[PDB]
Amino acid sequence: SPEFRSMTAIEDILQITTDPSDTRGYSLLKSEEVPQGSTLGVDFIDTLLLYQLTENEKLDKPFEYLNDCFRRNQQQKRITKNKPNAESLHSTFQEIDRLVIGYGVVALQIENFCMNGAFINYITGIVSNVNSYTDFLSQIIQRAILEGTALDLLNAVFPTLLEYCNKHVSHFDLNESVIYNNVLTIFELFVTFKPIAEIFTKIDGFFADYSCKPQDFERKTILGPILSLSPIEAAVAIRNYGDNLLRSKQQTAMIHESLQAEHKVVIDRLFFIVDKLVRGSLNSRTDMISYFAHIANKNHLRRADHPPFKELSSNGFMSNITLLLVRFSQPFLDISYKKIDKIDANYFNNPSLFIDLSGETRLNSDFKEADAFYDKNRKTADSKPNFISDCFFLTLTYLHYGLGGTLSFEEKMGSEIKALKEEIEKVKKIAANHDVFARFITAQLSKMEKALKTTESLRFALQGFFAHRSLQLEVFDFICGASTFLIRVVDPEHEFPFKQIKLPLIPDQIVDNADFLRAHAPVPFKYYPEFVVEGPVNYSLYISKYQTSPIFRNPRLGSFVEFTTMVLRCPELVSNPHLKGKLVQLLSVGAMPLTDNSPGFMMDIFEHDELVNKNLLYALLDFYVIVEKTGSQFYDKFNSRYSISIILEELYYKIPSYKNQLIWQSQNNADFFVRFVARMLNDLTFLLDEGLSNLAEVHNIQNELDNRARGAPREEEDKELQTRLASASRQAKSSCGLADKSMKLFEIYSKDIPAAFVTPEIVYRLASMLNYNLESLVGPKCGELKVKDPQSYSFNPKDLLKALTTVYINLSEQSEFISAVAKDERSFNRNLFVRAVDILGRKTGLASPEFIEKLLNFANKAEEQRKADEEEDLEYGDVPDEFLDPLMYTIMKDPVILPASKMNIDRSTIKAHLLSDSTDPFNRMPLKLEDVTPNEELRQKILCFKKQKKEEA
Amino acid sequence: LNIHIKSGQDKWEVNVAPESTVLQFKEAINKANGIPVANQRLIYSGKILKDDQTVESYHIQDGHSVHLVKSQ
Numbered sequence A: 001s002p003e004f005r006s007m008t009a010i011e012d013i014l015q016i017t018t019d020p021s022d023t024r025g026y027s028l029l030k031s032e033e034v035p036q037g038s039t040l041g042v043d044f045i046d047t048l049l050l051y052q053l054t055e056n057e058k059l060d061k062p063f064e065y066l067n068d069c070f071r072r073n074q075q076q077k078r079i080t081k082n083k084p085n086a087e088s089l090h091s092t093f094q095e096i097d098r099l100v101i102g103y104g105v106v107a108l109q110i111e112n113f114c115m116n117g118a119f120i121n122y123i124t125g126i127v128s129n130v131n132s133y134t135d136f137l138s139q140i141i142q143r144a145i146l147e148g149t150a151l152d153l154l155n156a157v158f159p160t161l162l163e164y165c166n167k168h169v170s171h172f173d174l175n176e177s178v179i180y181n182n183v184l185t186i187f188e189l190f191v192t193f194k195p196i197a198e199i200f201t202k203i204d205g206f207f208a209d210y211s212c213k214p215q216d217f218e219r220k221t222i223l224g225p226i227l228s229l230s231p232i233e234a235a236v237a238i239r240n241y242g243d244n245l246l247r248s249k250q251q252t253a254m255i256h257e258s259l260q261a262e263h264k265v266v267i268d269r270l271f272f273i274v275d276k277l278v279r280g281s282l283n284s285r286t287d288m289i290s291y292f293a294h295i296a297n298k299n300h301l302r303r304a305d306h307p308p309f310k311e312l313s314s315n316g317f318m319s320n321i322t323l324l325l326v327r328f329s330q331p332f333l334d335i336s337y338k339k340i341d342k343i344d345a346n347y348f349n350n351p352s353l354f355i356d357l358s359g360e361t362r363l364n365s366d367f368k369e370a371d372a373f374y375d376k377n378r379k380t381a382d383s384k385p386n387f388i389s390d391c392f393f394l395t396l397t398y399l400h401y402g403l404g405g406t407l408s409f410e411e412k413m414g415s416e417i418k419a420l421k422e423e424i425e426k427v428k429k430i431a432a433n434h435d436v437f438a439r440f441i442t443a444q445l446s447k448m449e450k451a452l453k454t455t456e457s458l459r460f461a462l463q464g465f466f467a468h469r470s471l472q473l474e475v476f477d478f479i480c481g482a483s484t485f486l487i488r489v490v491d492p493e494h495e496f497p498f499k500q501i502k503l504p505l506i507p508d509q510i511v512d513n514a515d516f517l518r519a520h521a522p523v524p525f526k527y528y529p530e531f532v533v534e535g536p537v538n539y540s541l542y543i544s545k546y547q548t549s550p551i552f553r554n555p556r557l558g559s560f561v562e563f564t565t566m567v568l569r570c571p572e573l574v575s576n577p578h579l580k581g582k583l584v585q586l587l588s589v590g591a592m593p594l595t596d597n598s599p600g601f602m603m604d605i606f607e608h609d610e611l612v613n614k615n616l617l618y619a620l621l622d623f624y625v626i627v628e629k630t631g632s633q634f635y636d637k638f639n640s641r642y643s644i645s646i647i648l649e650e651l652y653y654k655i656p657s658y659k660n661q662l663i664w665q666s667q668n669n670a671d672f673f674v675r676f677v678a679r680m681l682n683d684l685t686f687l688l689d690e691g692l693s694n695l696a697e698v699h700n701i702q703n704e705l706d707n708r709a710r711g712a713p714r715e716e717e718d719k720e721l722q723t724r725l726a727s728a729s730r731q732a733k734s735s736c737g738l739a740d741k742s743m744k745l746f747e748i749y750s751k752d753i754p755a756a757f758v759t760p761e762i763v764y765r766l767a768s769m770l771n772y773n774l775e776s777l778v779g780p781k782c783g784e785l786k787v788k789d790p791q792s793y794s795f796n797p798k799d800l801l802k803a804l805t806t807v808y809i810n811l812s813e814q815s816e817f818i819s820a821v822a823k824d825e826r827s828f829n830r831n832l833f834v835r836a837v838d839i840l841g842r843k844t845g846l847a848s849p850e851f852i853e854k855l856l857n858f859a860n861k862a863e864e865q866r867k868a869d870e871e872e873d874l875e876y877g878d879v880p881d882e883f884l885d886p887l888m889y890t891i892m893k894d895p896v897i898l899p900a901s902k903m904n905i906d907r908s909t910i911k912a913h914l915l916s917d918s919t920d921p922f923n924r925m926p927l928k929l930e931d932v933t934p935n936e937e938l939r940q941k942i943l944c945f946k947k948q949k950k951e952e953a
Numbered sequence B: 001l002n003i004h005i006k007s008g009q010d011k012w013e014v015n016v017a018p019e020s021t022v023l024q025f026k027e028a029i030n031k032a033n034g035i036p037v038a039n040q041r042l043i044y045s046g047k048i049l050k051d052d053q054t055v056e057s058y059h060i061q062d063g064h065s066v067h068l069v070k071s072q
């Protein structure tokens, strides 16, 4: 028959018979009388299924049965298409299709339908073999959309997928390759349906509860587990690296590459998923902002010195979100900057709607002011977001707290590893004779060994991640874009990068101007959070240690150098000197010559970017001085000066226009130039002492460590010494290093502008500073120093001497200089130069014979000036100096003390001076004749002296 | 109509006017079987029912089986 042909097709497709007892594994219908009719056909199909699913049996995997029912149906359509009479069975396939799909929706909407299994089991079956449920599921989704019940379906699947991820796999992470892929395939299947994408964020548990702890964001929140897929997850790092931590570079490289390849795919898939949500509707998109903003708000401790890691989101989770946000920000920050004005510069002109700014330090402002600025401004309630602007500032938020917390975690690991190896070494020495104690000690070793394997494994994985150029590139390009944007916010015109910005914003100020600077700081920039600057710079400093750094040769690098230079040029912009310290450190990294002696990677920008080449030099010379005003702390005024000096030196060697602006400044803006030099000079009076002293402190500390028989002469804590020992090593390197750079700078400048160095405010201080340094270098202060590997501590007494003596040569034709050096009793001795010559000839090629003769020639002129002076005093110096008027050169009659300069001067001289010029004549301070003070004591000495002379000759 | 409210073990026959909604069809059972207002879930011919739609809007027959589910 053909009624027959239908009937049996049902048997095969549903695997069920009625009367029926033999042949294939099908289940006998029990025991319904109405469906004990030995016909069959299209309208018994509801009943067969209804029995199949609710009167049950050992039908233990009902959703799988549905899915195989569907696949059996699709296959029987194909077999049929090409056979004698396809058409007559069409009604039958139609009906199985109708109902297998309908009950698939039902099975995934209400829990108790079948009495075998529940949601968890069904979706477990789905996860295991996702490709086999894809066509079916797709049809189920569509049917739910058509019936107005998509949400109910979503509330069945996605909360269930949550539990599946936390509770039915030991660890949902990158190790579980089949499972995390299949989970992604599920999100992609659902969220590719537009009506699903538009309501996804309404799923139960999409947001975190009020009580949800930060570490559980990635566990208790619908998107959490997939967002946490990453190679920088401990269990992933351990599996891939902790496996064999002694692999060669080549062997580690292969692992980095697999995990980088796999992480790229994860980020692509996560982005695709989240972009769907963003594109769904304003609600979904607003809820994403809201979702990411909550995670960020509750993870600020990720940037504390000692983060509570177990109470915070994980690095993989926070980094992956940072990258997705970078990816949504890309389009409005492409290099044409044609959409740069989509980002609202006044984002913070009002109380913030998503990002919690309480406790956030601002660039040049405090709380009182920022809250007051709100008053004046706000923006009427309802007048809010701009998804773009939300996304840009959230990206900056996560760059700092997300990746920023991830990089500082990796950075500290080299020390954690070394300390942990030392404890293990020491616990391994214990001889534990007692069985309980031996078990305790082995438990202690074993726990430390495990912590060590975790750390060493994670360090590899984090390195794999940060060395991933393709991903890090996006972070940096975001940063470059963010820099251009920030230049625009600063621009009074708000026209940049379409019109150059004019610097400086306010005229250059010629003692406690922080208030002044804050007051003329530009608005709204001064209210932006510090994190918008600290995130980029922390990232850039850190990322610089990677050979594959995204910064190296990146054509957008210039935008960031531009922003940095503007920041260093205009002190009103960023008040925080540690931050500026980091920035100049960054420029110094780009200034360092390469290992092959090519220019540093930023040299090109320094030369050809109009904005940089117009401002950098001045910015550096200014900042060198300003860091003095309280700038212990470890982006030190001395570290900053060391950084500046590197840039100054390289600019001068390799870029003629910078040599010229340096010479220009000294010829045409002398007061500014001299202020920098006086500072360089003054630090050079003590830096070598400071370095030698820390080196001696290093030895005192190390000899106490050696004692063994022990004083203790006080040993305090053995770890307080090890701390103090490192601390003295740092200070030694920083002091010696800066002294090197400073002397080198005196050398190359004095070569070209000797005259700048011989004006009265510099020349005597300089002579005295050179001679004092010369004393250390050729005497026991440097002679008795012996540390092992003094290069570790930038200690090259030989180069420092070579540079010091080149400065003498470079000024040897300035007579004020020859004279100042001849008249400094405190250090000048011709023999210092003789010893200098002796010491330099000890490193062969250090000084040319020509050099040595110029040095001796210098020493002779000076020694000769000294003799002339001494002969002149002996033969014509008949009145003691303190008795002579400083201006008239004659015996004073009535000495008076000037109150500002403290100089002694004859009453009549000051009176002749104040008749025409109401100032102290030595320092230009205001002065009225009345304020002058009688030097009765000195007056006596003169009279007494005069009495002696009158009475004989 | 003449409709049988299966489960796998149970039945509570009902009479209801076709043009009447399913919200009446819930409360035609609530006080005739033992189960509360919102603890009802009705499944027929592949769809889940809705309070607002009529029993005839689903085209349910005389001598026909509608299934029910206890709703925690």
Ligand SMILES: [K+]
Pocket (backbone or CB within 6 Å): A497, A498, A499
């Ligand atoms: K431009």
